[PDB]
Amino acid sequence: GILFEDIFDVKDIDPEGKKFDRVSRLHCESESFKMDLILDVNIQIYPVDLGDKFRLVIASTLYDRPSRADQFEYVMYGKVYRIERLSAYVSYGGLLMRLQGDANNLHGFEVDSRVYLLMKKL
Amino acid sequence: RITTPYMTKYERARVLGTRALQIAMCAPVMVELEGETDPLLIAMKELKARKIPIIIRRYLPDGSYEDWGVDELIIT
Amino acid sequence: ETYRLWKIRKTIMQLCHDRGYLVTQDELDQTLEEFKAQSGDKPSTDLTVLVAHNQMFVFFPEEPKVGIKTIKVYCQRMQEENITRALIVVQQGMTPSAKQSLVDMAPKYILEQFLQQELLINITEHELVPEHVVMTKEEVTELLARYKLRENQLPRIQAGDPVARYFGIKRGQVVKIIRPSETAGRYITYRLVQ
Amino acid sequence: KYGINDNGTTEPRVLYQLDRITPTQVEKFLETCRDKYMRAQMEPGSAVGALCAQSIGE
DNA sequence: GTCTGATCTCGGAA
């Protein structure tokens, strides 16, 4: 059911300076796919640091009774809202994600569809 | 046949203006009303059900006229 | 200097082309070099046009203030040639007794009067003045009918207006004005004349 | 730039959502732009100068 | 206590 997944390396914890006390905007790079993503992460619950390999999975569904995909340890929920090497803008309420690049592996995406994140440190 | 087929806000006001005052003088009601005692609230129920016994006489300013049934108009 | 004794001749042969005469196109546009044939002589009347309709008779009297006698110089050749309309393009202005001599001899011959510096620019090609178009007699009757309007009740332009005096319009005619806009560019308005 | 519309099928399917304008939308686009234009006319008999005197004066 | 167009008196001229 997975739309998209790979291992990512966060390179700028916050690129233009800390603007918020609970959310910092990461800049990452993939492993051998070279998908740039610009992801906001609530760091009070899930602190992230510079140069930290972390998994990232985009899933349309998670399948406490149906026993969810919970091996990952940070799960958001939001919808894709723009597709502009394709960019693919996902919004998580206010937390933006601009997963980019190489439109052959981005093929699962669409517009106006519900999308989960499932992150995990390594 | 040449004026606007949209009921203007000045025609909706007076049609609700006089159908309220007609129904506040015991006119026959066309909407089998459901407890509304304000006569104005009955008249908007008359408009949305499109049952008002009123024909608007639209005056072109030369003196000629052009009739328009309130059934035959596009309210907002 | 001669930017005048030429552009005035350029203007009135734009003017009487707009009023519907037959000015050949080569006679219309002259550069100054085409008028440098006469350019030294006239500063230190040799300029008088007769053109006919598809017939006006302009005048450039070299006197600054045209008196009654100066009109009376060509009152007689006005009635000699059987011409009906004329123009008197003056230098300063008419003497205040002479303007009545136009309206005393009103219905026989027309003879409208212009100033020099009034005519040094073509006010039709001004950016603020939109394209006035004189409408025909049948163009009025399809106007009044569509709007169901009496001849009066139209917006009104004076008879002594600078563009009515340009186009040469008697009382009772209706001009059609194409005012340029930004969304349409064809905002059409009409004007009855006074 | 990419993504030929040969019949509307390329192999990455996502590419047809670049500028989607599908003809259910463009007919609803016209029926809205008509009716938004028709609605926003000057309603006849609307004290047109009395609106003007407030909108210059205020 | 001015800001106002109108309406009255003077004067130099074709």
UniProtKB/Swiss-Prot annotation, chain A:
GO molecular function terms attached to this record: DNA-directed RNA polymerase activity; single-stranded DNA binding
Source taxon at top rank: Eukaryota
Region (Non-specific ssDNA binding): 14-38
Keywords of this entry: Acetylation, DNA-binding, DNA-directed RNA polymerase, Nucleus, Transcription
SMART domains the record matches: RPOL8c (SM00658)
InterPro entries: NA-bd_OB-fold, RPABC3
CC per GO annotation: cytosol; nucleoplasm; nucleus; protein-DNA complex; RNA polymerase I complex; RNA polymerase II, core complex; RNA polymerase III complex
One Gene Ontology biological process: transcription by RNA polymerase II
Main location: nucleus
Keyword NAD on entry: no
Any Pfam family the entry gives: RNA_pol_Rpb8
SUPFAM superfamilies, A to Z: Nucleic acid-binding proteins
Compartments in which it is found: Nucleus; Nucleus, Nucleolus
Keyword DNA-binding belongs to the record: yes
Role this protein plays: DNA-dependent RNA polymerase catalyzes the transcription of DNA into RNA using the four ribonucleoside triphosphates as substrates. Common component of RNA polymerases I, II and III which synthesize ribosomal RNA precursors, mRNA precursors and many functional non-coding RNAs, and small RNAs, such as 5S rRNA and tRNAs, respectively.
Stated family: Belongs to the eukaryotic RPB8 RNA polymerase subunit family.
Name of protein: DNA-directed RNA polymerases I, II, and III subunit RPABC3
Organism whose genome encodes this protein: Homo sapiens (Human)
Classification lineage: Eukaryota, Metazoa, Chordata, Craniata, Vertebrata
Swiss-Prot record, chain B:
Predominant subcellular localization, coarse grouping: nucleus
Intrachain disulfide bonds: none
UniProt keywords, alphabetically: Acetylation, DNA-directed RNA polymerase, Nucleus, Phosphoprotein, Transcription
GO cellular component, one term: RNA polymerase I complex
Record's keyword annotation contains Manganese: no
Keyword field contains Ribosomal protein: no
Function, as annotated: DNA-dependent RNA polymerase catalyzes the transcription of DNA into RNA using the four ribonucleoside triphosphates as substrates. Common component of RNA polymerases I, II, and III which synthesize ribosomal RNA precursors, mRNA precursors and many functional non-coding RNAs, and small RNAs, such as 5S rRNA and tRNAs, respectively. Pol II is the central component of the basal RNA polymerase II transcription machinery. Pols are composed of mobile elements that move relative to each other.
Protein family per UniProt: Belongs to the archaeal Rpo6/eukaryotic RPB6 RNA polymerase subunit family.
Name this polypeptide is given: DNA-directed RNA polymerases I, II, and III subunit RPABC2
UniProtKB/Swiss-Prot annotation, chain C:
Cross-link (Glycyl lysine isopeptide (Lys-Gly) (interchain with G-Cter in SUMO2)): K65
Name of a matching Pfam family: RNA_pol_Rpb5_N
InterPro entries linked to this entry: Arch_Rpo5/euc_Rpb5, RNA_pol_Rpb5_N, RNA_pol_Rpb5_N_sf, RNA_pol_subH/Rpb5_C, RNA_pol_subH/Rpb5_CS, RPB5-like_sf
GO terms under cellular component: cytosol; nucleoplasm; nucleus; RNA polymerase I complex; RNA polymerase II, core complex; RNA polymerase III complex; RPAP3/R2TP/prefoldin-like complex
Taxonomy, superkingdom: Eukaryota
PROSITE patterns: RNA_POL_H_23KD
Key word Signal present: no
One MF term in the entry's GO annotations: DNA-directed RNA polymerase activity
Transmembrane segments: none
Subunit-structure text: Component of the RNA polymerase I (Pol I), RNA polymerase II (Pol II) and RNA polymerase III (Pol III) complexes consisting of at least 13, 12 and 17 subunits, respectively. Pol I complex consists of a ten-subunit catalytic core composed of POLR1A/RPA1, POLR1B/RPA2, POLR1C/RPAC1, POLR1D/RPAC2, POLR1H/RPA12, POLR2E/RPABC1, POLR2F/RPABC2, POLR2H/RPABC3, POLR2K/RPABC4 and POLR2L/RPABC5; a mobile stalk subunit POLR1F/RPA43 protruding from the core and additional subunits homologous to general transcription factors POLR1E/RPA49 and POLR1G/RPA34.
Protein name as it appears in the record: DNA-directed RNA polymerases I, II, and III subunit RPABC1
Organism this protein belongs to: Homo sapiens
Gene: POLR2E
Curated annotation (Swiss-Prot), chain D:
Intracellular or extracellular location(s): Nucleus; Cytoplasm, Cytosol
Known tissue expression: Expressed in the brain, in the cortex and the white matter (at protein level).
S-S bridge residues: none
Top-level taxon of the source organism: Eukaryota
Disease per UniProt entry: Leukodystrophy, hypomyelinating, 7, with or without oligodontia and/or hypogonadotropic hypogonadism: An autosomal recessive neurodegenerative disorder characterized by childhood onset of progressive motor decline manifest as spasticity, ataxia, tremor, and cerebellar signs, as well as mild cognitive regression. Other features may include hypodontia or oligodontia and hypogonadotropic hypogonadism. There is considerable inter- and intrafamilial variability.
Biological role stated in the UniProt entry: Catalytic core component of RNA polymerase III (Pol III), a DNA-dependent RNA polymerase which synthesizes small non-coding RNAs using the four ribonucleoside triphosphates as substrates. Synthesizes 5S rRNA, snRNAs, tRNAs and miRNAs from at least 500 distinct genomic loci. Pol III-mediated transcription cycle proceeds through transcription initiation, transcription elongation and transcription termination stages. During transcription initiation, Pol III is recruited to DNA promoters type I, II or III with the help of general transcription factors and other specific initiation factors.
Family statement: Belongs to the RNA polymerase beta' chain family.
Included stretch of the parent chain: 986 to 1043 of 1390
